[PDB]
């Protein structure tokens, strides 16, 4: 568009010298330490956005197996059968934050609040109904992220404009907020890790598994290597709740709008319009949920491949040999749905391959005996499935397997979990990486966050997040919580000193006394509230 190509860089982080000096005065950051700074604010040159958009070259046009995908679709829909959804009017769509951006070219005149206030409900419903029989191509910006991370590559997020976002919210928000309000299901979205929510999720994982073993894989380049077919499938599975509100042509045109606004459309990279070959833009209205559908698809496809690729004469259980026979005849010998066998296979999967999904992170409590025999998906099955349906290689180096159920999964949502004693029983508490917490404390992304005395909520929230480290067997893992607590104590003391010097009156209700004693953080992980 403009006459010169714009180059955008990323500034480095801002050092909080007070916090680091307090840390090194408390015996931290030595040699021989198990805890040193590993999450920093990495900076980038002017070739960051263009060299990160180039990673879409890993997205190849992938032709998925169709006689098997048309059954994995049924299994995924059975996984998504508890929820309800449909279309909602413009006066029922609720936005979380109105000050967020509105993409291109709507960022030139204001934020999203301008377009949610200038447009009434009537012409919002008019636009939504227009999209149900029309296609609106859309430009999506690529925004460089200014955030803390453990590796130096620039991460980018795709900024979808408001014209696609409002219609997608009106289409999907009922189902998206029904998923985020159900507890004990496969897709754990909307479930907190506080107030014993982690323990509840982790005990709903362990629901009827025979000889339990824990497994978790990783998708390399998850959002950039996905085939267009799996994204279209996810958009169709999320659109299977509109069997009453929407007609067939309306649903097809909504799918077309999703593909024209999300999957393969023009991408803005520094004042220049390119073409997105495919894969999900990670900033649209349905990204965590569609990615969860994709992850469940890959798991079910791995299970089907593992079950079919087994010999058949070595099959000890005589039922499951018949189940494999029926699986093959329902894959490659039937053209209509066999709902009885779909129910049976879904029950088999929920019985032997219990799962827990948040959009690319899965913790599975698969049967160990069946996996050793080869009747449920294992690591190598997922590797093969990602090789021939995702065009990426899944190495074992970052995918774990836990053989002891008393220590939980190795890593879920970047939170290590462990078994502790609370009260009279035992619960699981997720503890983060202390390097991450120390890096967040030391490296702020602004100047007003460096002073400290202005922001006590930052360190209170960090102490809330890093409380479970005290129950860890390693001592200097546990010392992080006390470091943050003494830092809050000193911060409050010097804030009171400064506000005693800049006035003559000391605050009558200084309510901070509970932030530096462990009851406020201990009550955070108790299942009463």
């Amino acid at each position: 568009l403009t006459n010169n190509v714009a180059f955008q860089t990323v500034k480095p982080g801002n050092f909080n010298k007070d916090f680091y000096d307090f840390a090194v005065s408390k015996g931290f950051f030595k040699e021989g330490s198990s805890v040193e700074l590993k999450h920093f604010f990495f900076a980038q040159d002017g070739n960051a956005a263009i060299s990160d958009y180039d990673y879409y070259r890993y997205n190849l046009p992938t032709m998925c197996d169709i006689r098997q995908l048309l059954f994995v679709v049924e299994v995924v829909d059975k996984y998504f059968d508890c929820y309800d959804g449909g279309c909602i009017n413009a006066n029922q769509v609720i936005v979380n934050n109105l000050d967020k951006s509105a993409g291109f070219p709507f960022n030139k005149w204001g934020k999203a609040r301008l377009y949610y206030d200038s447009m009434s409900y009537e012409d919002q419903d008019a636009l939504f109904a227009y999209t149900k029989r029309n296609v609106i191509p859309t430009i999506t910006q690529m925004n460089l992220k200014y955030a803390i991370s453990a590796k130096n590559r620039a991460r980018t997020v795709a900024g979808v404009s408001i014209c696609s976002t409002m219609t997608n919210r009106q289409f999907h928000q009922k189902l998206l907020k029904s998923i985020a309000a159900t507890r004990g299901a496969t897709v754990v979205i909307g479930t907190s890790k506080f107030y014993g929510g982690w323990h509840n999720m982790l005990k709903t994982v362990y629901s009827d598994v025979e000889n339990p073993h824990l497994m978790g894989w990783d998708y390399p380049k998850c959002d950039r290597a996905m085939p267009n077919m799996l994204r279209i499938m996810a958009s169709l599975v999320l659109a299977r709740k509109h069997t009453t509100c929407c007609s067939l042509s309306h649903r097809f045109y909504r799918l077309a709008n999703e593909c024209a606004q999300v999957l393969s459309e023009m991408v803005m990279c520094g004042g220049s319009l390119y073409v997105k070959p495919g894969g999900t833009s990670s900033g649209d209205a349905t990204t965590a949920y569609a990615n969860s559908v994709f992850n469940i698809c890959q798991a079910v496809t791995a299970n089907v491949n593992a079950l079919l690729s087994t010999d058949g004469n070595k099959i000890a259980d005589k039922y499951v040999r018949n189940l494999q026979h029926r699986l093959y005849e329902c894959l490659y010998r039937n053209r209509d749905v066999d709902t009885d066998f779909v129910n049976e296979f879904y029950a088999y999967l929920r019985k032997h391959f219990s799962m827990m999904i948040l959009s690319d992170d899965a913790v599975v409590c698969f049967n160990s005996t069946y996996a050793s025999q080869g009747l449920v998906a294992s690591i190598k099955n997922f590797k093969s499935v990602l090789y021939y349906q995702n065009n990426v290689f899944m190495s074992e180096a970052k995918c774990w397997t836990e053989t002891d159920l008393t220590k939980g999964p190795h890593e879920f949502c970047s939170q290590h979990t462990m078994l502790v004693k609370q009260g009279d029983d035992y619960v699981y508490l997720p503890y983060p990486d202390p390097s991450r917490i120390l890096g967040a404390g030391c490296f702020v992304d602004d100047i007003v966050k460096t002073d400290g005395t202005l922001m006590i909520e930052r360190f209170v929230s960090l102490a809330i997040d890093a409380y479970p480290l005290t129950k860890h067997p390693n001592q200097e893992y546990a010392d992080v919580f006390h470091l943050y607590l003494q830092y809050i104590r000193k911060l409050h003391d010097e804030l009171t000193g400064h506000m005693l010097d800049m006035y003559s009156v000391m605050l009558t209700n200084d309510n901070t006394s509970r932030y530096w004693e462990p009851e406020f953080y201990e009550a955070m992980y108790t299942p009463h509230t």
């Binding site: 204001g110 377009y115 073409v275």
Partner: protein, 186 residues
């Protein structure tokens, strides 16, 4: 509240109470006048408490209406900005070649990716290193998209002018790559 006639009733009842205190009348008269004072209090306190929430809701509706008016005035401004942007981009259009390629079409529909490929009068090549410069736009004229373009300007990543004799094999490290050459259709 303080302007209501029930305040006048309460005030005259209280004046009667203080006048009877100054008079020192009988207990029955004082009790009756106290009953009158208490019912006046019961009326006026209730009415004032009703009016307080009334002022609250009046302020709330006032604020909502004020916000809605400002929203309308912002809507007009963004509408004007969008109209001006659209009409300026119309003034930027190259109507002759666009009309030619649209009239060549059957339905009148053409893919969007070929509109600049056949009607744009100015082209920009972004060149990461020297070998690609030697391979795509060597010299002062080059051929892309089945047309002939003449290089009018070469700028580096810092938007500084680079003369075409500056781009050599040995002089490549001294240039701030990438190079953005600008060419016009001939």
């Amino acid at each position: 509240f303080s302007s209501l006639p029930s305040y006048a009733a309460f005030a005259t009842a209280q004046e009667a109470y203080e006048q009877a205190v100054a008079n020192g009348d009988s207990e029955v008269v004082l009790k009756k006048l106290k009953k009158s004072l208490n019912v006046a209090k019961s009326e006026f306190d209730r009415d004032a408490a009703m009016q307080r929430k009334l002022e609250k809701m009046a302020d709330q509706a006032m604020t909502q209406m004020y916000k809605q008016a400002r929203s309308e005035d912002k809507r007009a401004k963004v509408t004007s900005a969008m109209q001006t942007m659209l009409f300026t981009m119309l003034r930027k259009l190259d109507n002759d070649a666009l009309n030619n390629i649209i009239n060549n079409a059957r339905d009148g529909c053409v893919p969007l990716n070929i509109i600049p490929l056949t009607t744009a009068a100015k082209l920009m090549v972004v060149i990461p290193d020297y070998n690609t410069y030697k391979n795509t736009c060597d010299g002062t004229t080059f051929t892309y998209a089945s047309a002939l373009w003449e290089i009018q300007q070469v700028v580096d990543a810092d938007s500084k002018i680079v003369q075409l004799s500056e781009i050599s094999m040995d002089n490549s490290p001294n240039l701030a790559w990438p190079l953005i050459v600008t060419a016009l259709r001939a």
